[PDB]
Amino acid sequence: IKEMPQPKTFGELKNLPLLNTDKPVQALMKIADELGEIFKFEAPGRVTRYLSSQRLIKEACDESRFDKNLSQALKFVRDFAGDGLVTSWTHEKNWKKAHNILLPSFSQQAMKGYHAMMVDIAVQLVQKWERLNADEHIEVPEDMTRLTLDTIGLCGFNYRFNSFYRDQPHPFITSMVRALDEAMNKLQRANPDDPAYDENKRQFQEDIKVMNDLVDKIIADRKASGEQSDDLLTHMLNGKDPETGEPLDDENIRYQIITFLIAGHETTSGLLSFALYFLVKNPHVLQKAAEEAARVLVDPVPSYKQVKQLKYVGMVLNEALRLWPTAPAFSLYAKEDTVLGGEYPLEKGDELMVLIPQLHRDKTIWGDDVEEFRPERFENPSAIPQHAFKPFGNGQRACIGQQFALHEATLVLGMMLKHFDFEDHTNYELDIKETLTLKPEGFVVKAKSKKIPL
Ligand SMILES: O=C(CCCCC1CCCCC1)N[C@@H](Cc1ccccc1)C(=O)O
Ligand SMILES: C=Cc1ccccc1
């Protein structure tokens, strides 16, 4: 039994001022590098323990001992994501009900149905880049976010955000991005009831109202038309939970749509951006991935079956998730009094944070080359220790979108590697912006067309 380390304190504010930064996850990674596999983090009226080693995280991933916790970040996001799948407690009726109803929508009949709409958006991205002039560059995270938002809009509720037709966001997205910014900014406020935050509070309620008004209109319009699209909204309007026999109510469907749009905007776009970053920084890996794309993608339009054959592209995506997991943390609570690692006694209700980027750098798991981008690490899942790789979280509360995201990302990256050569023309220095998620900021490349028709 030993005392865990704690980073530097600021009197009555304890550790809170350490998160007064635009890059708090990267700050917590530096603290983990200094203090090791576990540290205490205290703020006024709150304690969490940050875990970084596979040794402790394999225990934390035991669902008999620990359940998903809503981090303060998720509690603030719940003001607009409500009891949707990501901001619900496991014990809330609406978690298991929505999980049971939505699981068939997210399976590997389900990706075959979504494939054609994913191709529609992927083709828009390829045509955009084919149409750039010689002296122009690609803003990578910007274009990847246009793609992933458009894909979830089409697959979510048959709606075209038309992101490739715009410089300026759709009004829903203005409010969504501003609500996500307020939720994350609220984490670093020592005195949140200070009148200096009154405007922030008013704007937040306005953005919540905008998202609720616009999503509630989508649901009403669909019910009125009777239209039966192969989309998540149709599955949610028609689906019955096999346990209760009940469908979701319109309020919960609204929270699920808001949840899916947040995920679609924030997560897959980061993965694609980091994957292209690592490929241009590792030209031998880019060549091996481009050779696979050329051999497999023999038709103008990729098929579902061809995307499943892009094995090396899948490994590239897993190795990008290893080094920069775009959703970089998840939170757990102790279901009962328990001892972590034979060393750290926890009381029922005690909170843990899994620092996924630090887990993914455990040299006792990955070896001395842990900072190197080597997709071959993922050739054999049986050679990877248990709970070493957690970019989609854990257990029954793991990402329901994992297959959807990896299908979209594999399709798009395959088509990108088929259609273009890439140049890191600025020798880009990685700068990671933190919203809900991690994305390269300012990452630009030049694409040279291979002139292969669509
Ligand atoms: O670890 C963090 C900061 C990065 C979370 C990032 C996380 C948010 C969900 C999507 C995945 C990434 N926050 C903890 C501790 C805390 C609590 C209150 C005030 C300040 C810090 C929390 O949100 O509980
Ligand atoms: C962890 C991913 C996530 C996805 C949507 C909303 C909040 C969090």
Ligand SMILES: [Cl-]
């Ligand atoms: Cl102090």
